[model samples]
Target: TVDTSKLVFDGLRKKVTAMQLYECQLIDKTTLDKLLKGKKSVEEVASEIQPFLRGAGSIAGASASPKEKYSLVEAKRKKLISPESTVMLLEAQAATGGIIDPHRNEKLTVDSAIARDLIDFDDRQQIYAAEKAITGFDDPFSGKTVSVSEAIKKNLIDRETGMRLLEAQIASGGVVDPVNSVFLPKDVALARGLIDRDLYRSLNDPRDSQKNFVDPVTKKKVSYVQLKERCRIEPHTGLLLLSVQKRSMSFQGIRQPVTVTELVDSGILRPSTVNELESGQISYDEVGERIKDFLQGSSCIAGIYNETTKQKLGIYEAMKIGLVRPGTALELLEAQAATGFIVDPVSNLRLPVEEAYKRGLVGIEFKEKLLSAERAVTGYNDPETGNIISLFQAMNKELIEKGHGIRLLEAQIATGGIIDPKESHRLPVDIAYKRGYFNEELSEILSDPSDDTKGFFDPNTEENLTYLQLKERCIKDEETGLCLLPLKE
Candidate 1:
């Protein structure tokens, strides 16, 4: 055990001697022969190897490490290739499109061991240029030639260089569908001479001129603009129904069809309004004057209480304050029952008892009684409260939530043999259901998982899609839920 530690110490000392010989470029046949024939055991005698150890222990005339020597030589050797010769070498490589050197006998490449050892240095701009000049494929974007690695280093193409790289690929001979964000194929038929550029352009052009729709009921193709103009909304289901489905219904207490479609069936769309909706002859803006006049003629009760006077005002005083419609005065007066006489706002004439009670304007006392009488005629029983409530009363008293008043009005319209608000004439319930107004609960119903035939066609695909399918594939107006075809992907 005395020489165990000495054995380890002597082993390390011998390893250091070997490394020092390797580092000083001093290893020779004599030293190699001595190491191979060394028969003396480690513990035989420290004095037996003491003389050999002394030779290794001496540091006389030792030099720098081999790596340092090679680096210094490599620097001096690199300096031997003059700038002019460097240019010539690069020019030669560029011309031949291959690594070529007058003295290099082995295979050559920009990164080859021989080429790198001989020509590569800190000022390697020209050498790199020469390498890229021969190696790069065409630049897909500018059509100019550039190396991919440099382009990659400059962030031109990589996983994170998203759209710009994709755009370049698209402009190249890469093929992609209109629905794709990136090209799927690296090379396309257009570049291979299978199709002419003009042919592709003509075939790929969108059908803006002949865009048309197929009617749901008629199943006949109609111009898109004409179909849009003839459409009306079903507020409950948010369905935009065609003009063919229009029916007369009571809207806002007015027993008339909301749209002016009476003249349509007569070939008589009356030259004035026919082209306005059907032929697109007159734009809707052309009737600004008449529409303005009609709007000005229409009026509604504007105030429940007069804030300035701090008191509720009667209908007559409301009219004086520009709150009631001029034409509504006659109707209000005719409905009242309490007064013996009242003055007319239009003519200021006071009359006899019978006509006077019919024409009288009264304060809140009579107004309150008239509302109760109005409910007797027009009210519906509320399901929750089990009380008769008119639409106006429900709205004014905030008695309904979630637009219950609208539901009540639609229910009344439906009950009056009026199929849909947009329908021009009455139809039986069965026929109404057949015409897309199914009575089943439409709310919260999942769309059909299977593709079923739809009434309308997507002009792009020429495929009939259900409204639900159309919604899935198209960008829709936020509020109206109408598909904007131009924005379709």
Candidate 2:
């Protein structure tokens, strides 16, 4: 058995003795330096009281008397003189005005003669200013609310100046001038009426302007300046704009007027080089040859040229019927070139032959060439076979058979078909296993039967034989040969 009590007592004894020695050293030596100063060292002071200190150590022993400890403690206390005692004395002097003793018989009173000397007018003014500066800090001690008038009287603020400042703040949108206030473009515009209120408000208000109006002449909405210009041009322009406007409310009003530079940049028309067409410049034969070339070519220019020629012819016919504009001929030519209908022509107008052909909308051969080229680009047809190709491979007999088997199984389950054991042999081993036909059913199909039973073997078992085995037997036996059936199936 371990002596736990002795071990614990030994530990406590060591710890307690060390603690006692430290406390004794703190009181006798470390703490004595400040009090003893040059008169004596702390150890000497402690030595002077050695008899009392020894008695304290004996009293502190494990079984020493409490009375003895008290006496020893009191004797050590009598020898100690703390420097803090001077602080206590000073405090007492401050409390009693340096008087050795305080008298309860004497009454404290303020001398009126010294009151004026104590009062500082300048200091009072400064305090008043400070209080006024922090007026809203807290409630006053007096049991009353300070009125605005009274606060002003106390130098809190000038009422008139405060009111003027408040008005200025309100005018500046709840912000002091040049501080929190910000300039805004919209505010400036509103002040100047640079933005027309009626028009701006109409445009901004979704409910009122939900249904838009268009100018019939410009074939655009009447809300914008373009439609206004269109209306001014001709009555028909206005009519056309109105017709378009009536169809839809959300129509983007009208296109802005095209500048002369814009039209030239758009290739609508080019600068004239010659006053008139030269004899060798263009001919009926040349135009015809160009048309035939376009029809044979696989270029996109050929198709557009053909299409433009057709359009131009149609427009010309319409003009004869008074159903086209006077400038329709020029417009048609320009439109063809602009739309790349004509491959660049050598005329002053810079019209492409392809564009002219397209304007007239001729040459069906050109369209065929374009379609062929497009089909080639898109990989729509096989290069060798010329047959359309599909993304997926064609289904084979095996896939069909597997799919049919799954469908049949589902149908049998749905229709409550009876599953005969003999029928299990007709399916391949893998299929039978997947359909949960195992044990006897599987063994019957896998096992080779004797010669006698071979002729009358189970149809399902015979059907489930390996393909090679089935084929060999089928070739040997003519009537019920496996070769009669498709190999894949």
Candidate 3:
């Protein structure tokens, strides 16, 4: 019932999304009724009744991200903490003999983060794989897997860089592994007393020389995870008891006892073994065979027993999955910085928007926003000559004073305006001339002088000018600067 005189919907209907058009509000309902009653086409109604719903509305695509999405969620990457706090954490780790799990709350290493920031989409998977090679737990450090403590000692990363990485990880969630690959949940770290607890260092950790026990396999010693597979106490409990009748961890896991003759046959009792053990004259290695017997009866995670699922794993393997190794927090901050999340800590202002693009920090859209903001500073200055001014006061006065009209105008016509900047190359002749990209000298070179609809043309798509439509001839494309005057139409 509102006047339809101004409405002219052409491509708007197709361009508008269904999410933007689902009939919800009163105007939408009225439009729907009119549309269904055959009184008006949806496009015609949208153009006249609700122009925005037909793709011009601010609400249209309102859900899209406002800036580059390369930055992860705050949950994945947190803000930086103070350098002093980061140092305190590093000192604590060193003081504890690497017992303190410095990386109990973080997941990224600065070196890799720097690598990630520098590389493009094609390199993402490779970056991800590198994260796992460091401290992979299965054969920790066998390949490229270095532990957090080992990374620091080996100088794979520097102290200052490490601190920044740690600060970022702690603020975001804190790094919790060798250098930052696998994620360790905050709750898990806290529960294990590896983070924000009285024991930032767990005595139970395999790194602790005293608590752990090892046995030779292939003349090489292995930790608890390897120990389980290498040794077992199955099929019968009787043989286990006789073998450890003197040197075992008391073998309480089994009830049936084996004969001394059997023990003698197995070399557990060399006839005098019984008298030596009973007389308290015999002793175990204190950490060797006694501990080995204990593990056979103990339980573990991800790999269970009493019938273990492939999903169950014991001490060292579980540590591989959840253990938080120590690492420098500063590296986290550095990683984020290399990616383009630049902020001056002292001034707390964004770096001059123009500086960001050259560093690959912001995408083209980001550059455009800065360009748009800087360009928008226009209006009134005291008129000795009674007139409005040419700048809009949006950001800082420096940018306001530094804005260029020519470059600002070129931005709009490049790609003629595209979501992606890589393709915005072609130029139109008239737009090029009005914008000063075309010159008076070039007019003599004009091919179709009489029918002159002047503009630069793409040798590729052959579309109308990316800079602007033809109003005059251009000597060359503004972006590529290739000759545009004599191409066949």
Candidate 4:
């Protein structure tokens, strides 16, 4: 029903006229504008050579009716765009069964079919949000074959807006899929179940992937998989794809007999989450809740906490140990560093409880100075009042008006001190004595080098007293010496 003559004529007309814009010379509009010889508008120049313009091609007389407008738009659009853009427009239109037209700006709002096809219907902010959504973005022309997320971004820019061609490539399968491209068949990858859900991410995870496997027996990193290969895997482990290399096939050399790739790829086993793993013999079995359990169970051989570098230590040569329940150690650290950090009683070393808290090593409840007994333990008299106050006496004034004023180093948590009597059965006498927190009587008792060794020497028993035992014998023991030596905070 549509007339054929006008369509062919209009297209041929634009091709011929635009051809004369130069000996097909293509320097872009700015350069051509200068060469055209006058500051006149394009329409003015056309008017200057009206007869010639009319004969060659002119839309001056054409009315903006549905038929003529379509012809004119196609002609105008066809001239400025590259061969690649035409295909992209068609591909976008094909996505919705040609119902919602992409290239046709019937409303004449923003621009054209090129950008709107892949992107959500929004403004310029839409493009920027799309760019930020991409976790990785690499330089396509950089000649490096590194990551998948980055590669997809580099390939999908709309050129004009300097943004993505569509909603994020990872979010929406965009042009990389066959439905959008004439060359590809619909649902080809999805049908095969080889589809990777996260098109925005890469297999090269920033976690334990780059590091070599940790050998459980040797307690060191191994070059290749051998016997007793303990991986950095937990509920929070990195999973290999069903088609990864044979070297990464087995866990620690013959741990799990048949892998998902062997069973599923060979049609012997069926997967819960399709090609991407879910729960299987060689799959990511645990859910999000259990990851915490695995982390507490035994964080590989590499769970050492280093004081110097303030980093996670490797498997071997790790010295420190703590309770597997993370909450307990973190709470204790907060109490040890009453104010901000705990001063080491032995080495006079400072442990940054604040820094530890800042690094997500502890909880918010522990990062308080409410229970600091620092000044209390170090002083006998209050500086302001010059009152003969014990560490306990100043504690009342030290208490901030908002909460408990000053913290005191005492026995129980509710008693307003650091030591949890329930958790730490007794006091650390050696630490107290070294920090000058011991009473004059207790100090004289242990001042002699004849002290058994690690704690205090019991002259009566001719035996070394444990740290807590010495504290009780000299200070904590009723009717003996100082019942309790409090510190000033």
Residue 104 error, candidate 2, Å: 99
* lDDT digits (tens) for residues 1-489 of candidate 4: 222221111111132232243322212465345434444344443443332221211111111222222222242243422233223222222221121231332211123333444223332333232222211233557754322223444654333221122211211232222211111111443343223334312222434222232322234533222211311221221211011111223211011133434433333234543333331334444322222211111111112234444433311112123212233233234333432234332232333555545554434654554134323322335568764443333444553231122212322212222221111211234433333333445333333433332332233344544333433442221322122211111
- Ordered from best to worst TM-score, the candidate numbers read 1, 4, 3, 2
Model 3 RMSD to the real structure? 43.2
**Can you give the TM-score per candidate against the true fold?**
0.19, 0.12, 0.16, 0.17
List the global CA lDDT of all models. 0.33, 0.25, 0.29, 0.28
Clashes of each: 7, 41, 54, 16
Model 1, poorest ten-residue lDDT window?
54-63
The lDDT of model 1 is 0.33
Q: Which stretches of candidate 3 lie over 4 Å from their true place?
A: 1-144, 178-182, 185-489
Local error of candidate 1 at residue 423 (angstroms): 15
lDDT of 3 by residue, 375-454 (tens): 22222233354543332111123333322322223222222210111111112334334434334453343332223322
Minimum summed lDDT over a 10-residue window in model 4 is located at: 293-302
Worst 10 residues of 3 by lDDT: 55-64
Query: What tens digits encode model 2's per-residue C-alpha lDDT throughout 117-152?
Result: 221233333223222211221226553433222334
Local error of candidate 3 at residue 382 (angstroms): 21
